[PDB]
């Protein structure tokens with residue numbers, strides 16, 4: 264019912280629309296109820312919107328999985344709850360075996376379906392999380408941006424920031440790379456990008472004085488994080504530019520969540536983030552595959568015991584707000600405010616209609632200066 268957008272730093276977690284996912288190291292990710300997700304996950308990405316059955320045609324949809332044991336009403340109720348805590352719930356488009364192969368002219372229907380779902384479940388936006396085979400499949404590069412622009416405009420008209428994020432695998436983010444049409448077509452529409460810095464093996468970048476810095480090199484983790492992010496935020500070393508304010512670092516929760524890319528020593532991330540902060544380009548947060556893995560089991564049935572949220576939650580939420588933020592100072596008696604000057608007072612935002620001083624928001628009647 265209420266589009267709830269994030270203007271501050273994010274800790275993003277994917278949520279599995281399936282039970283008992285099998286890990287890379289033989290572990291188990293159970294289905295969990297939304298309201299069970301750790302509250303420091305302030306963006307939760309419902310995975311996935313997909314073609315379940317090609318006989319329904321080319322437009323992906325979302326169907327809550329029965330086996331999670333949650334009525335539709337009940338899942339909507341939990342979204343509402345998240346929204347009441349100021350957290351977002353996005354619908355992730357794509358994933359493995361999504362069968363998304365759209366042809367030119369599909370964008371109208373795709374946008375209609377985006378909107379139908381969004382109004383039905385109360386999603387706050389959409390994560391583009393295509394599998395590799397979809398990135399340039401049929402006309403996806405045209406249809407998906409075209410649809411998402413229409414969706415973004417629809418909700419702008421009605422007061423709302425429908426969030427658009429993306430989860431490109433990082434090697435597709437070279438200048439003029441296969442992902443870059445999504446980035447350029449949705450520039451000024453997208454909120455932030457949370458690339459996957461995992462599942463890409465020896466892919467990496469070369470830095471003089473250091474050598475090849477691979478994504479699966481756990482000994483050079485701080486250098487990897489730092490330089491791959493510095494390249495992206497400056498558009499340098501043959502990477503497409505994603506500004507630091509729109510750049511969230513996507514990681515595996517644990518060694519079961521992905522083949523490679525798990526951060527063994529979280530000090531490697533703190534130190535890289537602090538260097539990026541000290542150079543005036545702090546990152547927007549972190550993302551993880553996945554909340555379900557962060558609550559899941561290893562092969563011996565040992566709980567991962569929410570270690571990823573333990574390691575990054577407070578780190579990121581203790582950061583200074585990014586440029587996106589809406590800072591609204593408390594009302595003050597001796598202050599002169601003017602048309603459009605917002606303040607905070609009694610746990611609510613008030614918006615000055617005209618010249619005022621010494622007039623407390625809430626006492627001003629229904630057609631006084633505070634509104």
Ligand code: NA
Pocket residue numbers: 264265266267346384385386387
């Ligand atoms: Na919502």
